[PDB]
Point group: D2
Chain length 386, copies 4
């Protein structure tokens, strides 16, 4: 009954189940988790692996010797459990020095510090076996219009990612970068606020093939956008390197609910797309167990993330395999959408009187698309009424 | 007192002052305007030129002879008034045949028809002197998840724009294309919903240099995004070919208020950016005089668009020229944001102990950014309290 | 398999399945339906009854003799089919005379006309057997701040509803009024924009017992609000006289999708609440079959409204009847929420040292609420995984 | 030049200028302020008074003797400076015991504790001279649908406010209560989420005359609502007891920007309304100086709150006093909106053939409202272009 195994490639950030529940209006409701106990507990639930920020694993300000001890204990738990570390990232947002950003801070010395802090953790990530290095520029942005010249900030952002790409290529590392967009919070507006803006920015980097996106369900929904559409565009561009799964109820603060909560139909269409397209990266949950919960609730919430993915996977597979749905997809001309408009070429199209001079515009207009019957078949499959 | 002249390059769509006031819940409140009278009235107000959809100028279904008469009358009014036509576009959204899209309709014959309808109007646009051809894919999208495979739809969208680029290059035309994003309305979600998604898509076309964006104030605000930030990214990429100016009060239906209404501070920062960056294209108003208004109100509303641009231009210029603001920009380190993070290069950065090992993180963190004083100087300038 | 019968009390507006598909950007895609054929088709699908605006049934401008013929034909179809008319309403929004409102138009003569048009249809409604008369003030509002003094407008709104209440009481009619809120569209902001504002306004009418609310799923969601919470508050006040069921994907234009589309979890919690609370009014669908659809799609969409209600009803009933859920509700202390905080009274509470001086705040804080396990049981029931 | 004096009645919460800058993603950037130094600094800037939560003034867990010392020092600074304390409130949101609410927590013992904590601070408030006691139920709400039965929660909320009203009347205190709505954050949905819902709830309390609202600019804007419209409805009901002034850029997390930032036109129409209606309560700023700022920025930000109010007051007064605006208001029939629709009564309206049978609907429909000219006069006044 919907039991995960490590082959499902479910992964969790240390900061997810370890969130202590401090929010803008309230103190922590849970004690801190040791990363070693999170790894053990997640392995028991069926997870494949964990991810981390540098500062989740090594307390900020640690001496090089305390650092080695923290890494050794962590590596021992990975060996003991079989858990992998597919992705890592840098905390460029918690310490007050990053209050105006890391890569795009107005102060040049902070930007240099931000790059050195990142590069140190790239070495550690490679050593732990990570394939993807995520950058979430949560402090890159502004509350007021005069504080940030955005063209200069984008030059600084391009400069930072170009330098990181020079670093990994000169070291020979097999790691790729993924930019995680978010439209706002904690800054009033964040630079590269959606999947689209991040994809466009990547095309201006010196080595675009090293960079992709790490979209998050709740972040695109904070702009009211359709998250499966945005993932489709990332897949179309070949840039979906990693994904953050969670839930969000509309346009408000980033809730980071467990996956399947929030917009359930969008979760169904997301799973349908990822499975149909053969996405083979980690299914990573970036979620926060609500601060109402004790530790039993934390693990129930994490298990629910995986359960809901596996239920939706089953329902989406049943939908696509149902002959009556295959019939309806042809009734709605999804087959014709996949065929070229004009494989015959421009001159043939210009000479084709059936495309214009003799096109019967009223007969074409009268054809129904039959989309409502198709969508009700999808609803019936989701709810298990088929 | 803030009087426009044709050198300000203000332009209006025929469909703006000609909107009859039909909305989803109500009949028209104004009679139809003859395009010739709109051209004459706009020239009297100080406009530089007009834009059109094919179907605004030539009623749909016109014979080739009625078509020539419509164009001759229009050209005569342009000659009489001195008005230019800098941009044109195609109506691929009103006729029922486009109910599921034009370039990405599921029916292949509609997609071919959509391309032939576009190509016919490109010839007319070039003949009238337009430099920019806009595409707004208002029907390209979906209300439900199974109706549109977005990767196939993006293939069809790329196919259509590639064919249009082949057409203009084979004819030798000096015209460029601008894609106008919108996140929703009239479809539940529209493909390429923001500036960012459109910029990313352009990079996958065969001839990307022929394509840019035509962002609209109200459209990016329907996603809650910061419109001057999005324009900055378009300028940074070199792709701001045209712009649609209007106002919008937040995340709701597309209001198309006169420019300066809606988010007034964002309008100030937009004007500051366009003028500082030297944008030299048309200042185009895509707005709808509210249906409460009679014809005197229509022309008052159009005049207000231009007036508010010129007031904001004056206030933004006074802001940037004020020595006390120049001082505050340096106090907030805008000068340092414009300098390279690491012109000394990667190896120098890695060896620079002042960037990490000896960086005083607490002293850097204590420095205030002084952004609130800067923003209050900007408020004082906007309100004329300086 | 989820077949409606007239005992389920499903009702539809004539304007729903009869929507021709004209939107702000496009012409009609469907021909007009005769009201008599809509009644017959809805009866075949299992509906209980229909609702109407005056102008849906009697074309605007009809002579008193054409009016009688329209009503006779309609009454004959009701007799032939067994369909009831539980609710009626007035169109105070389509005709250009209502461009600035009906009850709160600035022009006094329009406000008087609006009241006479309403009163004429109240007589017809009573004659057809309606129990509820709905008022949706779609044009009452403003696009700009100086156009409407809202305190004077609320005086005029109170004046109009007080007069309508005087009319029904002086005639002896057994009909009640329900105000339908909406936050925006077609006006930039609409007066009484949410359930809450409407409930508060009712308390200032001369005869508050005659007035309740008719909330619409999609309208409260256009403000980002939780629609089952708002219905709970209306039930708590005793004012849920009628309800409009449909679906909406977030904060954007009013989509009026079929019920069950949009926010599916909110639809589940809404059905759970209506059924638990014993709401016994009509389950009315105010939805628009998308303009992609032909007539077969219209009836498929209407049938889907009813199907999804009946599936969600079954899942919510299974959820509430499941012993494991009953256990979890007690684990989360829903039983204690229903008990009085201080039935012992104020003085006892002030003397109770266990409520403050000796209250163990750290032990109470450590108790988890177990809400995530409860919510995953609800997800499992919704998806049929229990 | 726009200098505040204590007669302007500007007040600030201790928690505003004292916010240390801890947000969900980052540590504090500023040290804690002693309340005595905040009082002195605010008095120098021209403030009238301060407000507090119990826990801002008396650290949580203080002994009754430490409590007296904290109050004595505070009272000494009030005496030294002339500052008043017009409002106070209770912190029922920071401590983990309130993680599921205070008055509507599912655990009965927490609800009792919440009431005793409130009652203790009401005594202190009265002793310091406060006239208004605010309740913001920031934790009253839910992230999931099954966690809170909202009808039972509203019973508990009514029970708590009824008990507080019994307490103040039995003690003879001259203090009134004001409920502060907020739609979300930190709970996924908060009960009584808008001005309207709070006004409706007040009408079901045992002693409604003791309760009003304390609306906050940014909170109603987090639902996309028109804040001056909501204030107008509160004034119309006689319930605007207090107000929280700040700025917010659209639907997102609660930004609490300084007043005048965010939606500047809405701030102008708000000031116009408060001054026209003669609101005579405190002009209270509930804002957070951004965490980019040091202490000089904090005081600059607080001063900006007051400056922008006084500039907008001057511009709104000039607008209303301008003969050309008075002419335009009559052109738009604002005078007619203020006159009764039917002072002649129901029977006269029914007999008045000029209201229906002989009403010329086409002539009334053709009259323009002239709202765009009126709104451009308001824009010109705001920008100082008149
Ligand atoms: O950068 C990795 C993670 O960092 C932060 O915790 C963000 O809130 C989360 O969205 C992101 O994925
Ligand atoms: O395509 C040009 C214009 O077409 C339509 O009228 C749109 O509503 C407008 O946004 C667009 O700019
Ligand atoms: O007034 C009854 C109906 O009228 C209009 O058609 C509205 O769009 C709908 O929401 C409302 O319920
Ligand atoms: O309750 C008084 C204050 O408490 C909290 O600090 C809230 O965030 C603020 O909105 C409210 O006004
Ligand atoms: Mg998130
Ligand atoms: Mg996130
Ligand atoms: Mg994330
Ligand atoms: Mg628009
Ligand atoms: Mg537009
Ligand atoms: Mg446009
Ligand atoms: Mg609706
Ligand atoms: Mg509706
Ligand atoms: Mg409705
Ligand atoms: Mg706030
Ligand atoms: Mg607040
Ligand atoms: Mg507040």
């Amino acid at each position: 009954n919907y039991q995960p195994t490590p082959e499902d490639r479910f992964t969790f950030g240390l900061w997810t189940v370890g969130w202590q529940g401090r929010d803008p209006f309230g103190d922590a409701t849970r004690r801190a988790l040791d990363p070693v106990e999170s790894v053990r507990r997640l392995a028991e639930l069926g997870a494949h692996g964990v991810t981390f920020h540098d500062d989740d694993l090594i307390p900020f300000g640690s001496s090089d010797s305390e650092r080695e001890e923290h890494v050794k204990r962590f590596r021992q738990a990975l060996d003991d459990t079989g858990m992998k570390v597919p992705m890592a990232t840098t905390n460029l947002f918690t310490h007050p020095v990053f209050k105006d950003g890391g890569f795009t801070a107005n102060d040049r010395d902070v930007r240099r510090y931000a790059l050195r802090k990142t590069i140190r953790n790239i070495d550690l990530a490679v050593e732990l076996g990570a394939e993807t290095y995520v950058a979430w520029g949560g402090r890159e942005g502004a509350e007021s219009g005069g504080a940030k010249d955005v063209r200069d900030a984008l030059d600084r952002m391009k400069e930072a990612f170009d330098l990181l790409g020079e670093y990994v290529t000169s070291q020979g590392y097999d790691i790729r970068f993924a930019i995680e967009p978010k439209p706002n919070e904690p800054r009033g507006d964040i630079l590269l606020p959606t999947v689209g803006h991040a994809l466009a920015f990547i095309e201006r980097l010196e080595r675009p093939e090293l960079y992709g996106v790490n979209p998050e369900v709740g972040h695109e929904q904070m702009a009211g956008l359709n998250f499966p559409h945005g993932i489709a565009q990332a897949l179309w561009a070949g840039k979906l390197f990693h994904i953050d799964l969670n839930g969000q109820n509309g346009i408000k603060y980033d809730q980071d609910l467990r996956f399947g909560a929030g917009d359930l139909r969008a979760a169904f269409w997301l799973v349908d797309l990822l499975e149909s397209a053969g996405y083979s990266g980690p299914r990573h949950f970036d979620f926060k167990p609500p601060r109402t919960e004790d530790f039993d609730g934390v693990w129930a919430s994490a298990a629910g993330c995986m359960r809901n993915y596996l239920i939706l996977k089953e329902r989406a597979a049943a939908f696509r395999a149902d002959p009556e749905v295959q019939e309806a997809l042809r009734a709605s001309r999804l087959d014709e959408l996949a065929r070229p408009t004009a494989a015959d070429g421009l001159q043939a199209l210009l000479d084709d009187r059936s495309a214009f001079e003799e096109f019967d515009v009223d007969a074409a207009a009268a054809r129904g698309m039959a989309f409502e019957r198709l969508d009700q078949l999808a609803m019936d499959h989701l709810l298990g009424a088929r």
